[PDB]
Design an enzyme around this catalytic site. Structure first.
Site, PDB file in Angstrom:
ATOM      1  N   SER A 150       0.882  -1.335  -0.026  1.00 56.91           N
ATOM      2  CA  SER A 150       0.060   0.063  -0.065  1.00 56.91           C
ATOM      3  C   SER A 150       0.980   1.057  -0.124  1.00 56.91           C
ATOM      4  CB  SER A 150      -0.756  -0.045   1.223  1.00 56.91           C
ATOM      5  OG  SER A 150      -1.523   1.346   1.480  1.00 56.91           O
ATOM      6  N   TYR A 206      -2.168  -2.183  10.181  1.00 58.10           N
ATOM      7  CA  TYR A 206      -2.241  -2.109   8.514  1.00 58.10           C
ATOM      8  C   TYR A 206      -0.837  -1.356   8.051  1.00 58.10           C
ATOM      9  CZ  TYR A 206      -3.765  -2.061   3.710  1.00 58.10           C
ATOM     10  OH  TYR A 206      -3.865  -2.097   2.359  1.00 58.10           O
TER      11      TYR A 206
HETATM   12  N1  LIG Z   1      -8.733  -2.119  -2.001  1.00 64.98           N
HETATM   13  C1  LIG Z   1      -7.577  -1.221  -1.851  1.00 64.98           C
HETATM   14  O1  LIG Z   1      -8.014   0.033  -1.813  1.00 64.98           O
HETATM   15  C2  LIG Z   1      -6.200  -1.653  -1.561  1.00 64.98           C
HETATM   16  C3  LIG Z   1      -5.356  -0.538  -1.509  1.00 64.98           C
HETATM   17  C4  LIG Z   1      -3.914  -0.884  -1.402  1.00 64.98           C
HETATM   18  C5  LIG Z   1      -3.716  -2.214  -1.190  1.00 64.98           C
HETATM   19  N2  LIG Z   1      -4.671  -3.237  -0.926  1.00 64.98           N
HETATM   20  C6  LIG Z   1      -4.243  -4.611  -0.784  1.00 64.98           C
HETATM   21  O2  LIG Z   1      -4.756  -5.671  -1.772  1.00 64.98           O
HETATM   22  C7  LIG Z   1      -4.773  -6.862  -1.282  1.00 64.98           C
HETATM   23  C8  LIG Z   1      -6.239  -7.250  -1.545  1.00 64.98           C
HETATM   24  O3  LIG Z   1      -6.948  -6.568  -0.723  1.00 64.98           O
HETATM   25  P1  LIG Z   1      -8.528  -6.450  -1.431  1.00 64.98           P
HETATM   26  O4  LIG Z   1      -8.772  -4.776  -1.640  1.00 64.98           O
HETATM   27  O5  LIG Z   1      -8.680  -7.255  -2.676  1.00 64.98           O
HETATM   28  O6  LIG Z   1      -9.355  -6.904  -0.387  1.00 64.98           O
HETATM   29  P2  LIG Z   1     -10.559  -7.842   0.010  1.00 64.98           P
HETATM   30  O7  LIG Z   1     -11.638  -7.821  -1.211  1.00 64.98           O
HETATM   31  O8  LIG Z   1     -10.980  -7.815   1.406  1.00 64.98           O
HETATM   32  O9  LIG Z   1      -9.792  -9.247  -0.295  1.00 64.98           O
HETATM   33  C9  LIG Z   1      -8.835  -9.787   0.573  1.00 64.98           C
HETATM   34  C10 LIG Z   1      -8.789 -11.269   0.195  1.00 64.98           C
HETATM   35  O10 LIG Z   1      -7.799 -11.739   0.872  1.00 64.98           O
HETATM   36  C11 LIG Z   1      -8.247 -13.029   1.652  1.00 64.98           C
HETATM   37  N3  LIG Z   1      -7.681 -13.355   2.925  1.00 64.98           N
HETATM   38  C12 LIG Z   1      -7.868 -12.712   4.205  1.00 64.98           C
HETATM   39  N4  LIG Z   1      -7.138 -13.184   5.205  1.00 64.98           N
HETATM   40  C13 LIG Z   1      -6.623 -14.527   4.526  1.00 64.98           C
HETATM   41  C14 LIG Z   1      -5.841 -15.527   4.944  1.00 64.98           C
HETATM   42  N5  LIG Z   1      -5.577 -15.554   6.346  1.00 64.98           N
HETATM   43  N6  LIG Z   1      -5.496 -16.329   4.262  1.00 64.98           N
HETATM   44  C15 LIG Z   1      -6.043 -16.660   2.879  1.00 64.98           C
HETATM   45  N7  LIG Z   1      -6.621 -15.517   2.427  1.00 64.98           N
HETATM   46  C16 LIG Z   1      -6.926 -14.286   3.307  1.00 64.98           C
HETATM   47  C17 LIG Z   1      -9.892 -12.867   1.483  1.00 64.98           C
HETATM   48  O11 LIG Z   1     -10.318 -13.847   1.799  1.00 64.98           O
HETATM   49  P3  LIG Z   1     -11.965 -13.975   2.689  1.00 64.98           P
HETATM   50  O12 LIG Z   1     -12.960 -13.844   1.687  1.00 64.98           O
HETATM   51  O13 LIG Z   1     -11.922 -15.534   3.191  1.00 64.98           O
HETATM   52  O14 LIG Z   1     -11.826 -12.955   3.615  1.00 64.98           O
HETATM   53  C18 LIG Z   1      -9.836 -12.023   0.260  1.00 64.98           C
HETATM   54  O15 LIG Z   1      -9.857 -13.330  -0.709  1.00 64.98           O
HETATM   55  C19 LIG Z   1      -4.503  -6.825   0.107  1.00 64.98           C
HETATM   56  O16 LIG Z   1      -2.993  -7.164   0.411  1.00 64.98           O
HETATM   57  C20 LIG Z   1      -4.602  -5.377   0.624  1.00 64.98           C
HETATM   58  O17 LIG Z   1      -3.710  -4.788   1.511  1.00 64.98           O
HETATM   59  C21 LIG Z   1      -5.903  -2.862  -1.244  1.00 64.98           C
END
Ligand SMILES: NC(=O)c1ccc[n+]([C@@H]2O[C@H](COP(=O)([O-])OP(=O)(O)OC[C@H]3O[C@@H](n4cnc5c(N)ncnc54)[C@H](OP(=O)(O)O)[C@@H]3O)[C@@H](O)[C@H]2O)c1
Length: 282
Positions: A150, A206
């Site tokens: 991030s 985070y």
């Molecule tokens: N969206 C943003 O604005 C943003 C910005 C910067 C960085 N990111 C990063 O992008 C990445 C993906 O996030 P996202 O925005 O796509 O969020 P999301 O829609 O909440 O997806 C998170 C994913 O991670 C999985 N997960 C959580 N805990 C886990 C575990 N212990 N083992 C395996 N899988 C696990 C979740 O599974 P469940 O369905 O089981 O919970 C889900 O498939 C993250 O690293 C996040 O920090 C996101």
């Protein structure tokens, strides 16, 4: 000829969209999920898109050694190697609890248990998965590891001069030194001394998790010069992480890690990218 990828946390969000893009380019992709039903449902959606690359499902919880081992053995048996690992699984470490008058300062609650879990998933889960799959990545002609981070992972989000001194000193970075940063952060969290000890007061776990993931990316890149090992802010994306808030779609955000997975063989390693642009670790 055929290339193999694993994307952690890919039943939804950016991870799901990353699987889609990789498979659209002809890459054989293992979509993974900690919940089997969520993962199988996601697989079905990808199958409906008629992409050139084969898509498979395997369960994976990055916090569970047995789960990680099972995934590694599956990759070994099915493919004999791995070409791409995307460490996408992550959580934010918070829980939700006149229009001008509307105050949202208390809507996100942070607890020690949530902080600990956030670090376990975001950092130790990325390390555990990477360690388990490294022997298979070493058998690729051009291995890539993409760590989703991030913009909040930049060192400037941590006031502590002590912490920045360790985290920013690339030449002396070790996994043991990252543990010392984490240990101190968690101790300070539990003692209620975040402000006094120079930690971020909000989204604390985070931010620390992502700064540490960035540092870990640098360690890896130095150890494995034949690999492309990069970290990336995919952008502020409309996913469940933000309860649907964001500027980009998850599909748009996934372009960024996908580019790092599909770099040319002479491409960069050990860098931080803000979306499509190389950016500072500072
Ligand atoms: N969206 C943003 O604005 C943003 C910005 C910067 C960085 N990111 C990063 O992008 C990445 C993906 O996030 P996202 O925005 O796509 O969020 P999301 O829609 O909440 O997806 C998170 C994913 O991670 C999985 N997960 C959580 N805990 C886990 C575990 N212990 N083992 C395996 N899988 C696990 C979740 O599974 P469940 O369905 O089981 O919970 C889900 O498939 C993250 O690293 C996040 O920090 C996101």
């Amino acid at each position: 000829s055929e290339k193999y990828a694993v994307v952690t946390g890919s039943n939804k969000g950016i991870g799901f969209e990353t699987c889609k893009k990789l498979a659209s380019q002809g890459i054989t992709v293992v979509l993974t999920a900690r919940d089997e039903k969520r993962g199988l449902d996601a697989l079905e959606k990808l199958k409906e898109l008629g992409l050139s690359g084969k898509v498979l499902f395997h369960q994976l919880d990055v916090t569970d050694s047995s789960s990680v081992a099972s995934l590694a053995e599956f990759v070994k048996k099915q493919f004999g190697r791995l070409d791409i690992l995307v460490n996408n699984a992550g959580v934010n470490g918070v829980i939700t609890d006149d229009p001008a008058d509307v105050d949202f300062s208390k809507i996100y609650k942070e607890t020690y248990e949530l902080a600990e879990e956030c670090i376990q998933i975001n950092y130790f889960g990325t390390k555990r998965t990477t360690d388990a799959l490294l022997p298979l990545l070493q058998l690729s002609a051009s291995p890539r590891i993409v760590n989703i981070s991030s913009i909040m992972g930049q060192l400037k989000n941590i006031p502590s001069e002590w912490a920045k001194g360790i985290l920013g000193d690339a030449s002396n970075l070790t996994e043991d030194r990252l543990d010392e940063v984490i240990n101190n952060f968690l101790k300070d969290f539990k003692e209620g001394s975040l402000a006094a000890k120079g930690w971020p007061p909000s989204f604390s776990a985070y931010i620390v998790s992502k700064v540490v993931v960035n540092a870990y990316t640098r360690i890896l890149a130095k150890k494995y010069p034949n690999f492309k090992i990069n970290c990336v802010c995919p952008g502020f994306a409309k996913t469940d992480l933000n309860h649907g808030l964001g500027l980009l779609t998850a599909e748009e955000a996934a372009e960024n890690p996908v580019k790092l997975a599909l770099l040319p063989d002479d491409g960069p390693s050990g860098l931080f990218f803000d979306r499509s642009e190389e950016s500072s670790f500072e």
